[PDB]
Design a protein around this motif. Structure first.
Motif, PDB file in Angstrom:
ATOM      1  N   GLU A  37       0.728  -1.153  -0.170  1.00 57.64           N
ATOM      2  CA  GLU A  37       0.029   0.069   0.125  1.00 57.64           C
ATOM      3  C   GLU A  37       1.021   1.116  -0.062  1.00 57.64           C
ATOM      4  O   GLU A  37       1.697   1.747   0.963  1.00 57.64           O
ATOM      5  CB  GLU A  37      -0.927  -0.086   1.094  1.00 57.64           C
ATOM      6  N   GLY A  61       0.511   3.691   3.120  1.00 59.02           N
ATOM      7  CA  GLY A  61       0.736   3.105   4.529  1.00 59.02           C
ATOM      8  C   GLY A  61       2.110   3.689   5.257  1.00 59.02           C
ATOM      9  O   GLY A  61       3.226   4.318   4.253  1.00 59.02           O
ATOM     10  N   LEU A  72       4.662   2.446   6.697  1.00 59.75           N
ATOM     11  CA  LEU A  72       5.894   1.840   6.328  1.00 59.75           C
ATOM     12  C   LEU A  72       6.298   1.964   4.900  1.00 59.75           C
ATOM     13  O   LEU A  72       7.603   2.230   4.826  1.00 59.75           O
ATOM     14  CB  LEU A  72       5.758   0.354   6.503  1.00 59.75           C
ATOM     15  N   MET A 119      -4.860  -9.934   6.256  1.00 63.34           N
ATOM     16  CA  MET A 119      -4.060  -9.048   5.810  1.00 63.34           C
ATOM     17  C   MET A 119      -2.518  -9.477   6.338  1.00 63.34           C
ATOM     18  O   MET A 119      -1.500  -8.935   6.048  1.00 63.34           O
ATOM     19  CB  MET A 119      -4.146  -7.584   5.992  1.00 63.34           C
ATOM     20  N   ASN A 151      -5.539   4.893   5.963  1.00 59.92           N
ATOM     21  CA  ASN A 151      -4.867   3.906   6.244  1.00 59.92           C
ATOM     22  C   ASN A 151      -4.005   3.840   7.539  1.00 59.92           C
ATOM     23  O   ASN A 151      -3.561   2.659   7.957  1.00 59.92           O
ATOM     24  CB  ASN A 151      -3.894   3.651   4.806  1.00 59.92           C
ATOM     25  N   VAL A 162      -6.392   1.675   9.858  1.00 55.94           N
ATOM     26  CA  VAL A 162      -6.075   0.294   9.558  1.00 55.94           C
ATOM     27  C   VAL A 162      -4.945  -0.259  10.105  1.00 55.94           C
ATOM     28  O   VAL A 162      -4.752  -1.269  10.479  1.00 55.94           O
ATOM     29  CB  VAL A 162      -6.310   0.007   7.906  1.00 55.94           C
ATOM     30  N   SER A 163      -3.760   0.560   9.651  1.00 50.29           N
ATOM     31  CA  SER A 163      -2.495   0.223  10.487  1.00 50.29           C
ATOM     32  C   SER A 163      -2.527  -0.016  11.907  1.00 50.29           C
ATOM     33  O   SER A 163      -1.977  -1.467  12.223  1.00 50.29           O
ATOM     34  CB  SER A 163      -1.335   0.866   9.655  1.00 50.29           C
ATOM     35  N   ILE A 196      -4.707  -3.198  12.918  1.00 52.64           N
ATOM     36  CA  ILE A 196      -4.025  -4.421  12.692  1.00 52.64           C
ATOM     37  C   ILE A 196      -2.895  -4.689  13.725  1.00 52.64           C
ATOM     38  O   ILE A 196      -2.882  -5.409  14.799  1.00 52.64           O
ATOM     39  CB  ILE A 196      -3.631  -4.739  11.462  1.00 52.64           C
ATOM     40  N   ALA A 197      -1.724  -3.778  13.496  1.00 55.25           N
ATOM     41  CA  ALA A 197      -0.573  -3.999  14.459  1.00 55.25           C
ATOM     42  C   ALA A 197      -0.974  -3.981  16.113  1.00 55.25           C
ATOM     43  O   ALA A 197      -0.365  -4.629  16.721  1.00 55.25           O
ATOM     44  CB  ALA A 197       0.365  -3.141  13.909  1.00 55.25           C
ATOM     45  N   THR A 219       0.230  -8.190  17.246  1.00 59.32           N
ATOM     46  CA  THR A 219       1.407  -8.283  17.742  1.00 59.32           C
ATOM     47  C   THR A 219       1.304  -8.736  19.097  1.00 59.32           C
ATOM     48  O   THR A 219       1.720  -9.863  19.434  1.00 59.32           O
ATOM     49  CB  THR A 219       2.315  -6.888  17.435  1.00 59.32           C
ATOM     50  N   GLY A 247      11.983 -11.958   7.219  1.00 66.45           N
ATOM     51  CA  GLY A 247      12.394 -10.599   6.441  1.00 66.45           C
ATOM     52  C   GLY A 247      11.555  -9.436   6.960  1.00 66.45           C
ATOM     53  O   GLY A 247      11.468  -9.312   8.265  1.00 66.45           O
ATOM     54  N   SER A 248      11.268  -8.527   6.102  1.00 67.51           N
ATOM     55  CA  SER A 248      10.792  -7.088   6.764  1.00 67.51           C
ATOM     56  C   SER A 248      10.299  -6.192   5.554  1.00 67.51           C
ATOM     57  O   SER A 248      10.476  -6.746   4.361  1.00 67.51           O
ATOM     58  CB  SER A 248      12.031  -6.416   7.260  1.00 67.51           C
ATOM     59  N   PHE A 258      14.548  -9.499  11.992  1.00 65.63           N
ATOM     60  CA  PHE A 258      14.760  -8.918  13.086  1.00 65.63           C
ATOM     61  C   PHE A 258      15.394  -9.974  14.229  1.00 65.63           C
ATOM     62  O   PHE A 258      16.260  -9.655  14.827  1.00 65.63           O
ATOM     63  CB  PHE A 258      13.465  -8.235  13.481  1.00 65.63           C
ATOM     64  N   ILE A 314       3.623 -13.266  11.206  1.00 68.48           N
ATOM     65  CA  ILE A 314       3.956 -13.492  12.554  1.00 68.48           C
ATOM     66  C   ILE A 314       3.882 -14.941  13.014  1.00 68.48           C
ATOM     67  O   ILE A 314       3.205 -15.552  12.287  1.00 68.48           O
ATOM     68  CB  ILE A 314       3.115 -12.421  13.247  1.00 68.48           C
TER      69      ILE A 314
HETATM   70  C1  LIG Z   1      -0.897  -4.883   7.273  1.00 66.52           C
HETATM   71  C2  LIG Z   1      -0.533  -3.637   7.589  1.00 66.52           C
HETATM   72  C3  LIG Z   1      -0.478  -2.367   6.322  1.00 66.52           C
HETATM   73  C4  LIG Z   1      -1.653  -1.501   6.112  1.00 66.52           C
HETATM   74  C5  LIG Z   1      -1.681  -0.952   4.958  1.00 66.52           C
HETATM   75  O1  LIG Z   1      -0.717  -0.006   5.099  1.00 66.52           O
HETATM   76  O2  LIG Z   1      -2.467  -0.827   3.945  1.00 66.52           O
HETATM   77  C6  LIG Z   1       0.965  -3.310   8.079  1.00 66.52           C
HETATM   78  C7  LIG Z   1       0.999  -2.137   9.128  1.00 66.52           C
HETATM   79  C8  LIG Z   1       2.172  -2.573  10.187  1.00 66.52           C
HETATM   80  C9  LIG Z   1       2.549  -3.960   9.876  1.00 66.52           C
HETATM   81  C10 LIG Z   1       3.232  -4.628  10.913  1.00 66.52           C
HETATM   82  C11 LIG Z   1       4.403  -3.941  11.339  1.00 66.52           C
HETATM   83  C12 LIG Z   1       5.340  -4.811  12.553  1.00 66.52           C
HETATM   84  C13 LIG Z   1       5.473  -6.107  11.964  1.00 66.52           C
HETATM   85  C14 LIG Z   1       6.605  -5.851  10.921  1.00 66.52           C
HETATM   86  C15 LIG Z   1       7.273  -7.384  10.261  1.00 66.52           C
HETATM   87  O3  LIG Z   1       8.259  -7.149   9.320  1.00 66.52           O
HETATM   88  C16 LIG Z   1       6.052  -8.133   9.747  1.00 66.52           C
HETATM   89  C17 LIG Z   1       4.708  -8.281  10.687  1.00 66.52           C
HETATM   90  C18 LIG Z   1       4.437  -6.919  11.410  1.00 66.52           C
HETATM   91  C19 LIG Z   1       3.418  -7.390  12.546  1.00 66.52           C
HETATM   92  C20 LIG Z   1       3.780  -6.254  10.403  1.00 66.52           C
HETATM   93  C21 LIG Z   1       2.463  -6.867   9.810  1.00 66.52           C
HETATM   94  C22 LIG Z   1       1.874  -5.972   8.738  1.00 66.52           C
HETATM   95  C23 LIG Z   1       1.314  -4.489   9.194  1.00 66.52           C
HETATM   96  C24 LIG Z   1       0.052  -4.690  10.165  1.00 66.52           C
END
Ligand SMILES: C[C@H](CCC(=O)O)[C@H]1CC[C@H]2[C@@H]3CC[C@@H]4C[C@H](O)CC[C@]4(C)[C@H]3CC[C@]12C
Ligand code: HEM
Ligand code: NA
Length: 396
Positions: free
Chosen positions: A78, A81, A83, A167, A225, A228-229, A232-233, A237, A283-284, A310, A386
């Motif tokens: 996305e 997002g 990230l 997701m 967005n 949403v982030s 979920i996180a 987590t 990975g990441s 990590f 995860i």
């Molecule tokens: C699905 C979400 C994107 C929504 C969007 O932007 O449309 C993203 C945003 C933050 C992300 C998590 C961040 C921490 C972790 C990193 C690790 O490398 C992988 C797992 C980890 C738990 C991620 C998973 C995917 C997340 C929840």
């Protein structure tokens, strides 16, 4: 090409693939084929290298949003997002909600969070022993916290947990399936912020609704967005991490008994198990060099993608003595369980507080706690970004 596929192998319980220790010793920076996108990436397994990839403006995540760029997950990233933003765009996006996640404002949540924990542990002793710690604590506690912080209704959980579960796919669902769920979660979150239109709330969705027409420098896509982030996180987590720390505590009961004896050792224990636990499967989010960057054994060239593991950085024998051992009396612990640099977890203080309050309550109230389902039968989640338990039946 003959670069190995990464991940190397399907995960086992909370075990590290032993190839990471080999890579850290002999080839700390190696080429791999990620399961999605085209081409190869550098895998970074050592802590010094991970701090460069995560920490330097010469590595861009915005650059990684092209559907062709290698990635760990089936859908292209996305672009809106957090990230996938580079500073200074990323820094302006983080300010949308950062005030709420400062160590200082999270510490102020401790009284309400402790009280949430106690209520759910009251309900578990009502069911009586043995009970599934997933259904009674690991799910309901983080869910309740992120619902009151954001202002998502608690009775909307099955709905957003279905969305989050899809997701978080690494390999369980196909791109098309996840694409559809992302669109559904998008309109769901957009409707939640749009209800604040002539009805402002004192919660993070409240702040996201004021930004929708008081910022002119943040797009609506970026704002929705972020909701949403965080949803979920902000629970997934923590859910997994509660079952992960309990698994580490009950499979060598010595650890659990040590915290029962001195519950003040819980904060240090949490930092040690954050270091030790491979929560992140592999990975990441990808970082693409925008210039040549010197890592320990190689110059990465402008345009070459990189990925960090990590958990492997958290086992680096040059940073941590007896790295492969769990030690709650360790003196220094500069782990990256929460990442490093611009994208350092926004929720790091909230994850800490939730893990501190969940174990502290357990260790105080249930000194007799043991796993009451065979270790061989434990339902580890498969095909997700995860790791964690579907279920953890405990007795006391
Ligand atoms: C699905 C979400 C994107 C929504 C969007 O932007 O449309 C993203 C945003 C933050 C992300 C998590 C961040 C921490 C972790 C990193 C690790 O490398 C992988 C797992 C980890 C738990 C991620 C998973 C995917 C997340 C929840
Ligand atoms: C035990 C709890 C947690 C762990 C182990 C964890 C781990 C991580 C990691 C490793 C990253 C870095 C990803 C990368 O740089 O590629 C990260 C980023 C992030 N985490 Fe967390 N996290 C946790 C809790 C939370 C919580 C509680 C929230 C929200 C309330 C959250 C939201 C995020 C977000 C939004 C990002 C992306 C931030 C950015 O790009 O600037 N996480 N997390
Ligand atoms: Na990526």
């Amino acid at each position: 090409d003959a670069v190995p596929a990464y991940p190397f192998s399907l995960p086992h319980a909370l075990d590290l693939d032993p190839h990471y220790a080999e890579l850290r010793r002999d080839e700390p920076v190696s080429r791999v084929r990620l399961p999605y996108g085209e081409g190869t990436a550098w895998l970074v397994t050592r802590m010094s290298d991970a701090r460069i990839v995560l920490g330097d403006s010469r590595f861009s995540t915005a650059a990684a949003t092209d559907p062709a760029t290698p990635r760990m997950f089936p859908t292209p990233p996305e672009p809106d997002g957090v990230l996938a933003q580079d500073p200074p765009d990323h820094t302006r996006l983080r300010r949308l909600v950062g005030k709420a996640f400062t160590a200082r404002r999270v510490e102020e949540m401790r009284p309400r969070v402790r009280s949430l924990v106690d209520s759910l542990l009251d309900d578990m002793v009502a069911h009586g022993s043995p009970a599934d710690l997933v259904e009674f604590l690991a799910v309901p506690f983080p869910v309740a916290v992120i619902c009151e912080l954001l202002g998502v209704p608690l009775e909307d959980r099955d709905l957003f947990r279905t969305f989050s579960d899809a997701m978080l796919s690494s390999t369980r669902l196909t791109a098309a399936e996840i694409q559809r769920v992302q669109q559904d979660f998008m309109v769901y979150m957009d409707g939640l912020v749009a209800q604040r239109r002539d009805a402002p709330t004192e919660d993070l969705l409240g702040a996201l609704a004021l930004a929708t027409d008081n910022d002119d420098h943040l797009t609506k896509g970026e704002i929705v967005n972020m909701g949403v982030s965080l949803l979920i996180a902000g629970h997934e987590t923590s859910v997994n991490q509660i079952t992960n720390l309990v698994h580490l505590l009950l499979t060598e009961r010595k650890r659990y008994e040590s915290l029962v004896a001195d519950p003040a050792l819980v904060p240090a224990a949490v930092e040690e198990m954050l270091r030790y636990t491979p929560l992140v499967s592999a990975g990441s989010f990808v970082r693409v060099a925008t210039e040549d960057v010197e890592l320990s054994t190689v110059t990465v060239r402008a345009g070459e993608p990189c990925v960090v593991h990590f958990a492997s950085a958290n086992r680096d024998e040059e940073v941590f003595d007896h790295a492969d051992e769990l030690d709650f009396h360790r003196e220094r612990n500069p782990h990256i369980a929460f990442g490093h640099g611009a994208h350092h977890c926004i929720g790091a203080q909230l994850g800490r507080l939730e893990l501190q309050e969940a174990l502290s309550a357990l260790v105080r109230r249930f000194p007799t706690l043991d796993l009451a389902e065979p270790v061989a039968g434990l339902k580890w989640k498969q095909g997700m970004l995860i790791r964690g338990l579907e279920r953890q039946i405990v007795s006391w």
